Structures are given as structure tokens and as C-alpha cells.
């Protein structure tokens, strides 16, 4: 029995059991249940990492220090190991004899109490597989009689499905709800556990450092609950502090180290959490000017919104920023989104709203409900945001999206959360929602019918109101309009394209020179008013890249590494010189 | 001791190979071990990635002393799953052995246990983790981790996921170079620097079987063994790049020509090879070669696919022929998916869904996994007009970004696959007759049909619209001869000799071949006309022995006359 059962009280005297902090209310409920004449088996049910096991173990530590009531004093807590007991039986009666032997020891001592972690396991299959003589059946008479007291620990999901199916075992136990009271208790709790953790890593945790760790993990680390994750980040920080002192370096744990620790758990770029990159945010707008240009309001509006979020003035529950871009297609609305993620070094999430043109399509993003073919497959939107909490969400052709899709976005912008079929809570407040629409350009570009023209100042706004419901517009932080590209900007676009082609060739070892007049010709054919700058990529691709590639494999380019671009006035067709 | 060997002590004496690189990965493994709780590292990875070697490399580092003082005295022991399980063949006997082994490690503080392929075992794993007295290293496959570790909350909490990613191309050659002195000393012969770097590239592109780094180490050892074993080793003290390729042929199962470097050489011969087995339509094949020529030059975006092709005209326009020859010439496995079956919600789910079983998670997307199974394999699509417009939209997505994402989470890259399509819109319109008192030709341009059936964006992203010229009567006559030749060789084994008149070939050609159906009916027409009459005689009659056969036609009745001689 000693191999299977470990004495918590004896172990607590030596150490090992961490001191329990701020669980007086939870502990008091347990003692009341234990003092009952019958059914004196408290059951601790709570979410993962809520100190569920510590509460039971803490009772032993409290008894050792004599801080419990007189009735509780002079008691022993025993932690039963289900795995060890099941292992090595290899016979029909081996499990029963050892289990009955264990029960006899507890029954002999009235004061003795047992603790069974993950008690849900015994009810499913405690002793035998394919047989009804389980561990639960053995203890059901004893628990009802009151001879032995058993403490249990189970998760809410495990307690609801695996446990409570058998009413006989469930009634004997007394459900005790365990929930983290508040974030302030967690930092207070870590202070109590600070000596043990500090001693193991030979580090010291600053008061600011401990508080910073719990707060950072809450917002960024959603994999685990608040108490366990907070303890985990301060624990990992000690390891980082251990590696750095190769020879007599400082052993103190700084907030910067903790910031790096939370970044590793979430695998984020670590730029958002740290404030040392304020220079990049300060010059984010200037950098974007080198990128897609011609819209002073788009860059200014988007850059300003990100700055307030880092400054701490962003919406507590809503996304970092909600913006709708209404302008002609091909004017850079889409590129601003992909030119901001690269600059910010964060993931880019893009969804094709055109695909979601029917009512059935909306179920794909949130997943099918239980009992259906799509329950196994998680929602596309929920999976993407959960996988990438900090990223740029790009929705294109939002106007074409089914009305159902618009309804889903309402909760996203207002509450910052979306629930999938599985019921998981997807928190992606960090992402900046940006939508691109082409509805407005049609009204403004087209002239009013009739002899006398009419003002089109409000036609663009009217279209937005008709296409987008008012409730949707309210959540949007601002609506930015993209002005048509000027001739200079269009010519500038070609210069960037040749530079990109020249940069690609430079790596290969070929140098390209394009005549200034040739750039002007490419600009007119590549750029189209209705399509904006969309065809410029195809024109540059087919016209210039295809001929050069042939010579690169074999020809003048492979031997000489030189190429030139010219225009034929008579034929009005580009001519390329290879050397 | 007997059940689990001591890696740290083993490295002290030798045998363990020094680990080169993986400094960041090893650093994280050390960091978790130093943690007070949840200090059980998990070297998740794939077979051949070196996760087991990382454990062996970690043990070497501890004896070397490149670890913190706390980890300097730690000892790593690799649990032998086979040793404990073998010799018991009973439930619970194996557990008893594990309890004794665990007790020894528990007694000695600062003891590390390495359970290779831990997923195979997973009752006692949870208690050792919960106690925390001894930290444990676990190597599990990514697929097994989701199936076992993710499902079990207790196992996941104690174990920490350490991502082990395959090294880059440059990194893989560096690992071989770092380990090259050890190999050269072992067999006393060396490999050229060009040869080792080439081995990494040639192995992954052609074999595509175990792992990017694993294939490199396996291919180098295999090459040295062949060269050293051969008596020529005295004269040949270095390994040529071609020598490895010749040795790689044994583990390739394809001729040396395929394994031989043909990045630029294939272009010239492939054009000639297509014409060698295909007569005419030089312009059509030129379009195909031009698109793939761009990828070999490398002046293109990496994500963009290798090539985009299109085919139009009646069924059986050599789509299988040119594709099979193109795949053979490029040494890429031919993968063909037929859109003809994708006409229902269940069937259209097959591209990214797992029709075989919802319970089955390994297959995922059948079309998507096909690319994953063979990175360079060509994808042949046919009768795409039938498929729903919604299905066609997903094709546009992959064409733009050159990547796909499976429902299960797998990511497929289209940067290494050429996509070709086949359309048969022309036959439907041309066969129809105009509704008029006097009929008119209803033939229409193939390009016109592509525009109406498919969305404009598809044509824009597509590099060019390729229309294959229709079959010629001379080719049909040759096709008839090929089938007779195929039948002729088959008869020669049995001992029967068949002779066919030139007029007979022409006679079958007119009725058999059809414009709408191309050369498909001619094939079927040759089987029933020739196999059926001889078949009766072969079983019983004049052709039972001797096998003298003659084929001729009678002009008066316009019917084939078959002459059978006992011989």
C-alpha cells in the first residue's frame, strides 16, 4: 500500500507541498463536508490549473502547521495513485486484494482521509476492462456508510461527461466549485510561492516583475488558465536568467526577460509586448510612404490607430482598429494591408468573401454544430485567429459577402470575440480589421443622367449606407476613401516595378537598365482607370520577365550578365537588347 | 542498467557522433530541464529529422561540459521499449519491469530518462511526470502528438513541445560536411565538396522518400560503400558526382538518365522527345515547353507554380500521351485527378475532404495529399467544365498564392507542380446542326468556349490559352498499325503470325475513327474486329496449331474477309 499511497502529511513536514494562499472560502466548504456523518466526501471541480490539486494538498500542509479547526487536527491525508494500483495486477483478484487492503488501512483510522486525483478515471474503468466489478463499486458501500472519507479532483468537462453518469457515485460526493477569484490574488499567490521558485533557479523576482508576468500572460497566453500560466511564465523566466550568467553576471529577473518569455509561449514577434520598438511605430507612417502611396488619409488613419493601442488608449474589448476602405479597385486598398503586416512583422490573415456568397458558406467560418459532418472540422475563421492571435485580418469584397457574414462581424467588432461550434472562445482583439469595398466608386465615377449634371458629393456615402447596415457602420472606427491615382503616382508605380525586377535580376547576377520613355509607355498600357493598377503586374510579368528568362538559361545573359530595354516607335512595341 | 543504456557514459567512450548545429533547439531543451515544474522536454518531429540524434547530441554536450552546472552532472538514459516488452508477452508483466527500472532512476537524483517513440507505449508514464522526481525526454511524431498528447490534458501539461524543424538546404550540406571527416577516416576514401552538396539536391528532388537531411546522410554512405567495395577503389580515391547518381539509381528505381542532372539539358531533348513519339502539332508542344522553361531559368516568384497548361478539343487528343511523356521526360510521378466524378457535394468534398472515412484523419484532402506525397508530380485535370463553379474557385486561389491549406491543417505548396487542364467543349457545339432549311457548319473557336465556360479572372491568371490541333488522318493510319503491331507481338509468343493488308488498315480507319470521339473508337473497333474471329479458331479450328492468318477485304461487298489456314 505504501508504494501505491503516499502520505501527504508526512511529505508536507519535509516540504514539497507548496503553501496554499487565499483559499479560506474553498477550504472551509471542504471541512464542513468532511465533518458530515454520511457522504463526507468533498469533490473539487474546477477548470484546468485553478489550484484544484493544491487545495487538497494544502489541507495537509495546513494541518501540519495546526492552522485548521481542532476537529481537523490530528488527521492524515493520503494521495492514492490509480496508475500504480492498476499496474502490475495481471490477475482477476490482484487489484481487489490491494484495493481492499488500502481501504482497510483507512477504515482502521477514523481520522485518516484519502485523496484521489482525477477520480473520473475509476468510474469509467477502475479495476477490470469488460467487467462490471470496478473500483467505484467497491467504495460505493463504504462511502455511503461513512467509514472512509475520499477527496476528489475533476475537471468540469470530465465531471459532466465521465462523472455524474452514475448517480450512485455522484450522490455520495459533494460538488465544490473552484474558480480563480481575481487576478490580484494570483500575483499575491505567486509571492507566497516566490521563495520556492527563487531557490530552484537561484534568481530573485522584482515586485514589478511578478505583477507584469501575470498581466502579460492573461492578454497574450490563452492556452492555459490564469493561475497556471502566470506561474509558468515566472518559472520559465528563471531558466532564462540561469543561462545568461556565464561569469559573474547579474542574476536579477527583469521585466524585459519576462516579456521575452511570454513571447516564446505565444511565438509572437515580441515587438508588440516590448516598448523598445517605439521608433519603428514612430516612423511606421514614413516607412509606409516608401510603400504604397497617394493616400495621406489611409496611412495617417491606420498608423494613428495602432499608436493609441500601444499607448494603452485602445478599446478594452473591441479590436485594435476597424476600417472600411471604399475606393476604386487597384488603387492600393489591398496593398496597404499587406504592406503593414510585413513592416510590423506579423501574420496576415486573408479571407475571400466572394467565396462566401451563399447562406450555407457562413457555417464554414464558424463550423458545423454537433451531430453533423462538419463538427469534426473547426471553423476557418476561428482556427486562423486562434492559431494567429496577433495578425492582420484582411477581408476583400466585403460587399459581396452574404448578409449572414456581416452579422458575424458585428460581435467581432463590438465584443472582440467569436465562438465556434466547439464552444471555444476566440479572442483576437489584437488584430486590426480592415475591409475593402468597390461600391462607392461606381456612383462618383458615373455622371448623372440628364441634360444638367447633379452633385455627387453624397452619392458615395449614400451607397455605403444602403450596402452596409447602420449597426455595422457604428462599430467601424472610421471609413477612408481612396482617391484616384495621379499620373505621377502611376509613373512612380512603374519605377517600383522595374526596381523589383532589377533587384530580382541583381541576385541572379544580371543588371537591367530601362529607358525612362519606356517606363511611360508601360504605365499607360499597364494602368487602367476601371481596373486601377491591377494589369500592371501582368504586363510587366509577360512583357519583360518572359523574354529575359529565356536568355538567362542560355544566351547572352548567361555569358555577360547584361540586358537592356528599349521601345520601338514605329512598332510601339518594347525591344530588349541582350549582351 | 540492462533495460536502459547510458547515453552520457556511452558518449564518454565513443560511438556517439558529435552534433553540428541545432544550437537554438538544444538551448531550449536545456532551458525546460532547468525548470522547477513541467521540465519534461518533448522533441516533437518527423522520422529522420534527427530528434533521436539531438538526444544523443545532448548527452555528448553534458560530458563535454557545454551545459549549466546544474545539468553538468545529469545522466541521460534511453529506455529500450523492445527490451522491456520482449520476453513477457503478457499484460502487467511489462509494467512490473518498468516499475523496477523507474525505481532505480528515482533513487538517483538528477537522472534523465529518454523514451524514444514514446507514443508507442502511450499507465506509469503519468505518475513519474506528476511526481517530478525524474525528468523525462520524449520523442513523438507530430501526427501522434495530436492523437495522443493533445487528447490527454495531463500528458500535455507535463510535456513541453519543442519544435524540431528540418534544416535548410545549406544547413543539410553543412551537417554532412561537419560529419564528413568521420566518414572519410572510417573507409579511407573521401567525397568531393561538389559531390556532397549535389547529393542533398539530387536526393530530395528524385527520391522524395525519407527526410531532407536523412536522405543526404543515407545517400553519401551508400555511395561510398559501392565505390570502396568495387576493386576500382585503388584507382578511384574520390567520388564523382555521377558516381553517387549511379549509386542513387539503386534506391531510385529509375534509370541513370533520370537521376542525372537535367535541369537545362532536359529542355533540348524534351522537345525532341515529344516529337519522337508524337507526330505533328509542334506548335502545341512548344507552348508547353515555353511555360516550364521559365521555372528552370528561375526568373520568377518562388510561390508561383512551375507551369500552367491547358488543352482543348475532343476526348483523346493525346492528353494522356503528352502528359505521360512530359512526366517521364521530367522524371516526375504522373498524378491524374478526374473532375468528371466531382459533380455532387460528397464528391466535390474529395479535393480537400476525406471521402474514405470521417474517422480517418491521415488522408485528409485526396488531391492535396497527392501533392504532398510527390512534390514534383504533375497534376492532370480533365472535363473541368462539368465541375461546379464553386469548386473551380478554389483552383484560382492556389494558382495565385501557389499554396493550399487542408481542413486538417496541412499546408501544400504548388511551387513544384505543373497544372494542366483538358476541355471538350468543342465536340458538343460542332456536332449540333443549325436550325435552318439548309444546314451550316457549327464548328466554333476553342478559345471562345474557354471564355464563356470559365470566369475572366481564370484566364487572366492563366499564362496562356493553349489549343491542341485536331488529329490528322495520317496519324490515325499509324495508330491502326501500332495496335496491329501490339497484337502482332502478342501473337508471336503463342506462335501465331498475323499479316494485315494495307487496304485493311485504311478500311478500319474510315469507320472506326470519329471526329467527335477522336481516336478512342478506333482502339475499340480494332479489338472486336480482330480478336473475336481469331479467338474462336484459336481455341478450336485451323489456328490451334501453325497459326497462319491472313487479313483482307472484299471491295464488292465492302466487308472484311478472313482466311484461316491449318498450317
Amino acid at each position: 500500500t505504501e508504494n501505491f499511497t503516499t502520505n501527504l502529511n508526512q511529505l508536507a513536514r519535509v516540504g514539497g507541498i507548496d503553501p496554499l494562499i487565499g483559499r479560506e472560502k474553498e477550504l472551509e466548504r471542504a471541512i464542513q463536508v468532511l465533518c458530515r456523518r454520511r457522504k463526507n466526501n468533498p469533490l473539487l471541480v474546477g477548470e484546468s490549473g485553478v489550484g484544484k490539486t493544491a487545495i487538497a494538498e494544502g489541507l495537509a500542509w495546513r494541518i501540519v502547521q495546526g492552522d485548521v479547526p481542532e476537529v481537523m487536527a490530528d488527521c492524515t491525508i493520503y494521495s492514492l495513485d490509480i496508475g500504480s494500483l492498476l499496474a502490475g495486477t495481471k490477475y482477476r483478484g490482484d487489484f481487489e486484494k490491494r484495493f481492499k487492503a488500502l481501504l482497510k488501512q483507512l477504515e482502521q483510522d477514523t481520522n485518516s482521509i484519502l485523496f484521489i486525483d482525477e477520480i473520473h478515471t475509476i468510474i469509467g474503468a477502475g479495476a477490470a476492462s469488460g467487467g462490471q466489478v470496478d473500483a467505484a463499486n467497491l467504495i460505493k458501500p463504504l462511502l455511503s456508510s461513512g467509514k472512509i472519507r475520499v477527496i476528489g479532483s475533476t475537471t468540469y468537462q470530465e465531471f459532466s461527461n465521465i462523472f455524474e453518469k452514475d448517480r450512485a457515485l455522484a450522490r455520495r460526493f459533494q460538488k465544490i466549485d473552484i474558480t480563480e477569484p481575481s487576478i490580484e490574488e494570483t500575483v499575491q499567490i505567486i509571492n507566497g510561492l516566490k521563495p520556492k521558485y527563487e531557490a530552484h533557479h537561484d534568481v530573485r523576482y522584482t515586485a514589478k516583475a511578478v505583477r507584469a508576468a501575470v498581466e502579460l500572460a492573461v492578454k497574450y497566453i490563452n492556452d492555459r488558465h490564469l493561475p497556471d500560466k502566470a506561474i509558468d511564465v515566472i518559472d520559465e523566466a528563471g531558466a532564462r536568467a540561469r543561462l545568461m550568467p556565464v561569469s559573474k553576471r547579474k542574476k536579477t529577473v527583469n521585466v524585459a526577460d519576462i516579456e521575452s518569455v511570454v513571447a516564446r509561449i505565444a511565438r509572437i514577434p515580441e515587438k508588440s509586448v516590448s516598448q523598445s520598438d517605439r521608433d519603428t511605430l514612430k516612423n511606421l507612417g514614413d516607412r509606409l510612404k516608401m510603400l504604397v502611396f497617394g493616400q495621406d488619409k489611409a496611412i495617417e488613419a491606420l498608423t494613428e490607430a495602432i499608436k493609441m493601442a500601444r499607448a494603452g488608449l485602445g478599446h478594452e474589448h473591441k479590436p485594435v482598429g476597424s476600417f472600411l476602405f471604399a475606393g476604386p479597385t487597384g488603387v492600393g486598398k489591398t496593398e496597404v494591408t499587406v504592406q503593414l503586416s510585413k513592416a510590423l512583422g506579423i501574420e496576415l490573415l486573408r479571407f475571400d468573401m466572394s467565396e462566401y456568397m451563399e447562406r450555407h458558406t457562413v457555417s464554414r467560418l464558424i463550423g458545423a454544430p454537433p451531430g453533423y459532418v462538419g463538427f469534426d472540422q473547426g471553423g476557418l475563421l476561428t482556427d486562423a485567429v486562434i492559431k494567429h492571435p496577433h495578425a492582420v485580418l484582411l477581408l476583400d469584397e466585403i460587399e459581396k459577402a452574404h448578409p449572414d457574414v456581416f452579422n458575424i462581424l458585428l460581435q467581432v467588432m463590438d465584443n472582440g470575440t467569436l465562438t465556434d461550434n466547439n464552444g471555444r472562445k476566440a479572442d483576437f482583439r489584437n488584430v486590426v480589421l480592415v475591409m475593402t469595398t468597390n461600391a462607392g466608386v461606381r456612383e462618383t465615377e458615373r455622371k448623372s443622367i440628364g441634360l444638367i449634371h447633379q452633385d455627387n458629393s453624397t452619392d458615395a456615402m449614400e451607397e455605403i449606407k444602403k450596402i452596409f447596415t447602420p449597426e455595422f457602420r457604428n462599430r467601424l472606427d472610421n471609413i477612408i476613401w481612396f482617391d484616384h491615382l495621379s499620373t505621377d503616382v502611376i509613373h512612380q508605380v512603374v519605377d517600383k516595378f522595374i526596381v523589383e525586377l532589377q533587384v530580382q535580376l541583381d541576385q541572379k547576377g544580371v543588371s537591367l537598365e530601362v529607358s525612362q520613355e519606356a517606363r511611360n509607355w508601360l504605365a499607360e498600357k499597364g494602368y487602367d482607370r476601371a481596373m486601377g493598377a491591377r494589369p500592371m503586374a501582368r504586363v510587366i510579368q509577360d512583357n519583360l520577365k518572359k523574354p529575359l528568362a529565356n536568355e538567362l538559361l542560355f544566351g547572352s545573359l548567361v555569358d555577360g550578365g547584361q540586358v537592356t530595354v528599349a521601345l520601338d516607335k514605329e512598332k510601339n512595341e518594347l525591344t530588349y537588347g541582350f549582351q | 542498467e540492462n533495460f536502459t543504456t547510458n547515453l552520457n557514459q556511452l558518449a564518454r567512450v565513443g560511438g556517439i557522433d558529435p552534433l553540428i548545429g541545432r544550437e537554438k533547439e538544444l538551448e531550449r531543451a536545456i532551458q525546460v530541464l532547468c525548470r522547477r515544474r513541467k521540465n519534461n522536454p518533448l522533441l516533437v518531429g518527423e522520422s529522420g529529422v534527427g530528434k533521436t540524434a539531438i538526444a544523443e547530441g545532448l548527452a555528448w554536450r553534458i560530458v563535454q561540459g557545454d551545459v549549466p552546472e546544474v545539468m553538468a552532472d545529469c545522466t541521460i538514459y534511453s529506455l529500450d521499449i523492445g527490451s522491456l516488452l520482449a520476453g513477457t508477452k503478457y499484460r502487467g508483466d511489462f509494467e512490473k519491469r518498468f516499475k523496477a527500472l523507474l525505481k532505480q532512476l528515482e533513487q538517483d537524483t538528477n537522472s534523465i530518462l529518454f523514451i524514444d517513440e514514446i507514443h508507442t507505449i502511450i499507465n506509469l508514464i503519468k505518475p513519474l511526470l506528476s511526481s517530478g522526481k525524474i525528468r523525462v525526454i520524449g520523442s513523438t511524431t507530430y501526427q501522434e502528438f495530436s492523437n495522443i498528447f493533445e487528447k490527454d490534458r495531463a500528458l500535455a501539461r507535463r510535456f513541453q513541445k519543442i519544435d524540431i524543424t528540418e534544416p535548410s538546404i545549406e544547413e543539410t550540406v553543412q551537417i554532412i560536411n561537419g560529419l564528413k571527416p568521420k566518414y572519410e577516416a572510417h573507409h579511407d576514401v573521401r567525397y568531393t565538396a561538389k559531390a556532397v552538396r549535389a547529393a542533398v539536391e539530387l536526393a530530395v528532388k528524385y527520391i522524395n522518400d525519407r527526410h531532407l537531411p536523412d536522405k543526404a546522410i543515407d545517400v553519401i554512405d551508400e555511395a561510398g560503400a559501392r565505390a570502396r567495395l568495387m576493386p576500382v577503389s585503388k584507382r578511384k580515391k574520390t567520388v564523382n558526382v555521377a558516381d553517387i547518381e549511379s549509386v542513387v539509381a539503386r534506391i531510385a528505381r529509375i534509370p541513370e538518365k533520370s537521376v542525372s542532372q537535367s535541369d537545362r539539358d532536359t529542355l533540348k531533348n524534351l522537345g525532341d522527345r515529344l516529337k519522337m513519339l508524337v507526330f505533328g502539332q509542334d506548335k502545341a508542344i512548344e507552348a508547353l515547353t515555353e511555360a516550364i522553361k521559365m521555372a528552370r531559368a528561375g526568373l520568377g516568384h518562388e510561390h508561383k507554380p512551375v507551369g500552367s497548361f491547358l488543352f482543348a478539343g475532343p476526348t483523346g487528343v493525346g492528353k494522356t500521351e503528352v502528359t505521360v511523356q512530359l512526366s517521364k521526360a521530367l522524371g516526375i510521378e504522373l498524378l491524374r485527378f478526374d473532375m468528371s466524378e466531382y459533380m455532387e457535394r460528397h464528391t466535390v468534398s474529395r479535393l480537400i475532404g476525406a471521402p474514405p472515412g470521417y474517422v480517418g484523419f491521415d488522408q485528409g484532402g485526396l488531391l492535396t495529399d497527392a501533392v504532398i506525397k510527390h512534390p514534383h508530380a504533375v497534376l492532370l485535370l480533365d472535363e473541368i467544365e462539368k465541375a461546379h463553379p464553386d469548386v473551380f474557385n478554389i483552383l484560382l486561389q492556389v494558382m495565385d498564392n501557389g499554396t493550399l491549406t487542408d481542413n486538417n491543417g496541412r499546408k501544400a505548396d504548388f511551387r513544384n507542380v505543373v497544372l494542366v487542364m483538358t476541355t471538350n467543349a468543342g465536340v458538343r457545339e460542332t456536332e449540333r446542326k443549325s436550325i435552318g432549311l439548309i444546314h451550316q457548319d457549327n464548328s466554333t473557336d476553342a478559345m471562345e468556349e474557354i471564355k464563356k465556360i470559365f470566369t475572366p479572372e481564370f484566364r487572366n491568371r492563366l499564362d496562356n490559352i493553349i489549343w491542341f490541333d485536331h488529329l490528322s488522318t495520317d496519324v490515325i493510319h499509324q495508330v491502326v498499325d501500332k495496335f496491329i503491331v501490339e497484337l502482332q507481338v502478342q501473337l508471336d509468343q503463342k506462335g501465331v503470325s498475323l499479316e494485315v493488308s494495307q487496304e485493311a488498315r485504311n478500311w478500319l480507319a474510315e469507320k472506326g475513327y470519329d471526329r467527335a470521339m477522336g481516336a478512342r473508337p478506333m482502339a475499340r473497333v480494332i479489338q472486336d474486329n480482330l480478336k473475336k474471329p481469331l479467338a474462336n479458331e484459336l481455341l478450336f479450328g485451323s489456328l490451334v496449331d501453325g497459326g497462319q492468318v491472313t487479313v483482307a477485304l472484299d471491295k464488292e461487298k465492302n466487308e472484311l474477309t478472313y482466311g484461316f489456314q491449318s498450317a
Binding site: K90, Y91, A128, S129 | -
Partner: peptide
């Protein structure tokens, strides 16, 4: 489009030494 989800010990004999 509904989907349906479908869902060691032996006695021994002892021989005393002859």
C-alpha cells in the same frame, strides 16, 4: 447533412516441485 459517430486478466495454475 448529419453524421453518425460510431462507438487481460486470466487465472493461472501452479505446479508444486516434484
Amino acid at each position: 447533412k448529419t453524421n453518425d459517430w460510431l462507438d487481460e486478466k486470466v487465472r493461472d495454475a501452479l505446479k508444486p516441485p516434484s
